[PDB]
């Protein structure tokens, strides 16, 4: 081989190898980082899932597929319809 990466090119490798070469852990297999499996509460005001430690899942610059989502159910297209009642007070022309 001739080429060689000079820096790190593995940020998108969640897991490498599900084998068992000796019926145990392969001595160089990689399970995911605990950072990407965090499910923390969300501030109930603006979503923004946060890690369980308190750090927000928006600043670490590390993807993670373990967050939470909202769901409405049965009323999202309840459309804005109101009714109004008008009443005049002064006619345009009197004596008429």
């Amino acid at each position: 081989r001739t080429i060689w990466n000079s820096s790190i090119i593995t940020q998108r490798i969640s897991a490498r190898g599900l084998m068992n070469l000796e019926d145990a852990r392969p001595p160089e297999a990689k399970i995911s980082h605990q950072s990407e499996l965090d499910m923390g509460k969300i501030d109930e005001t603006s979503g923004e899932p946060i890690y369980t430690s308190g750090l927000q899942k928006m600043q670490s610059s590390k993807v993670s597929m373990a967050n939470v989502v909202l769901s409405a159910g049965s009323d999202v297209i309840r459309q804005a319809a109101i009714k109004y009642n008008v009443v005049r007070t002064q006619e345009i022309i009197l004596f008429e």
């Binding site: 009443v87 007070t89 002064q90 006619e91």
Partner: protein, 145 residues
């Protein structure tokens, strides 16, 4: 249907449908008389519409009585609150929105003005004591053994 609506247990506070009134001319007094009759004929349903009737009659008075109106506001502004047996009056010191009708006026410690005597009400703004005294039912109270 209106007549039967007299007795069945009311469960949702009712609001009046139509309201016509000329701003300056003295004809609106007809509308005042209309609701006076509607009160003297079904004293029950009025017991709830009291909230709306407050603001409506007060508006109409304001355009047809001025001394009485603003003097009355000054003293007996808008709401009873029974503190401990006494009755403190809270006002609305702003013509921001006086003609509102949605202030849960019949449940909670918040009573409408115009109605409970405080005999000083009369001899302060006549025609308003005269209105109020005309509407209270004063028929009876019967048991139903």
């Amino acid at each position: 249907d209106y007549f039967s609506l007299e007795m069945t247990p009311i469960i949702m506070r009712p609001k009046l449908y139509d309201f016509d009134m000329k701003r300056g001319e003295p004809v609106s007094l007809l509308y005042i008389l209309e609701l006076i009759l509607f009160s003297i004929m079904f004293p029950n349903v009025t017991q709830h519409m009291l909230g709306q009737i407050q603001a409506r009659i007060l508006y109409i008075s304001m355009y047809a009585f001025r001394q009485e109106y603003l003097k009355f506001i000054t003293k007996f502004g808008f709401y009873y609150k029974i503190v401990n047996g006494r009755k403190e009056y809270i006002q609305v010191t702003n013509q921001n929105e006086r003609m509102t009708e949605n202030n849960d006026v019949l449940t909670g410690n918040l009573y409408p003005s115009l109605f409970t005597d405080d005999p000083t009400l009369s001899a302060i703004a006549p025609t308003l004591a005269k209105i109020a005294r005309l509407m209270k039912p004063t028929t009876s109270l019967t048991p139903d053994d």
